[PDB]
Amino acid sequence: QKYLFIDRDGTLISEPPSDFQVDRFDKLAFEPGVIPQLLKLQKAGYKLVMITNQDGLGTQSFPQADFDGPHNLMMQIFTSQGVQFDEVLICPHLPADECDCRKPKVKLVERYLAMDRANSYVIGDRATDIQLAENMGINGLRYDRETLNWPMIGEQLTRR
Amino acid sequence: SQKYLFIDRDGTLISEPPSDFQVDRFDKLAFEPGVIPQLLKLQKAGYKLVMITNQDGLGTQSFPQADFDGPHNLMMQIFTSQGVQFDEVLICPHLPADECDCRKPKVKLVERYLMDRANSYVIGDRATDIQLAENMGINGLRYDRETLNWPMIGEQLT
Ligand SMILES: N[C@H](CO)Cc1c[nH]c[nH+]1
Ligand SMILES: [Cl-]
Ligand SMILES: [Cl-]
Ligand SMILES: [Cl-]
Ligand SMILES: [Cl-]
Ligand SMILES: [Mg+2]
Ligand SMILES: [Mg+2]
Ligand SMILES: [Zn+2]
Ligand SMILES: [Zn+2]
């Protein structure tokens, strides 16, 4: 079973450059082509898993209610359009917490470590996503809106 | 002559709030099933898209422009980022009691188009959308999430 482990902020949707928190609806923006390209990937047999660090989620620095509006709308778009994430895995911790689950640690995905490692990938926009791939023993794809975008990924991962 | 789809917004592209028929909060925004992939399919088949919507009392106390703008502009972001493009977004802001010239199924908003009529459609969830189609002299599709939905329309028209 081929899996795609996909980052949220800066990958599925844009990441706010001020505080890196999608905590208002006016900070929610989808990356280009993510919907048709995830549908394409699913049709080729990939299952999808979302994996994301959300520093301080559920605390006064990033209230659960502030995260929920934009996140739930994002998920309603995916689901209604036919994009299904098997799991949405979140680390809510601060870096200083030194938790077991903050990417690039693999705790959140331990159950997948089970899958076809040769044909599974982490997709994310940061060095930490690529390091997660290395820690998982799978391939890493560094999302970039210009140099490795959703259409390119959809093509690359369905090449035969 | 261009094939057009004239598509209603509320209850057709996005869910219609059952409470009060106004998408006036972000938390009332929800996309209809399959609308994105199907509109992309329809665009690839050569249809151009025009949105047309009655927004009762838009820009007054019971529906401020600012309340409409947030959810609408976000809906537009989502469609545009995913490759769905509307040539025009046509809005009637008036109350029914106003008895204006632009309220569907009156044809004012779309006068310019009055187009390959044999292959153009109004798609909407209300009888008035179907009447608009008749007044424009083109085909009408009565969108229903359960019985005549986006995958069905995408299949039929391609
Ligand atoms: N957006 C970052 C990565 O997903 C996590 C974060 C939340 N608050 C501040 N930083
Ligand atoms: Cl910002
Ligand atoms: Cl992250
Ligand atoms: Cl969020
Ligand atoms: Cl209407
Ligand atoms: Mg990221
Ligand atoms: Mg309607
Ligand atoms: Zn953690
Ligand atoms: Zn009017």
Swiss-Prot record, chain B:
Protein location: Cytoplasm
Residues annotated as the enzyme's active site: D8 (nucleophile), D10 (proton donor)
Transmembrane spans: none
Binding site for Mg(2+): D8, D10, D125
Residues that, per the record, bind Zn(2+): C92, H94, C100, C102
Region (Histidinol-phosphatase): 1-158
Family the UniProt entry places it in: In the N-terminal section; belongs to the histidinol-phosphatase family. In the C-terminal section; belongs to the imidazoleglycerol-phosphate dehydratase family.
Name by which UniProt lists this protein: Histidine biosynthesis bifunctional protein HisB
Annotated source species: Escherichia coli O157:H7
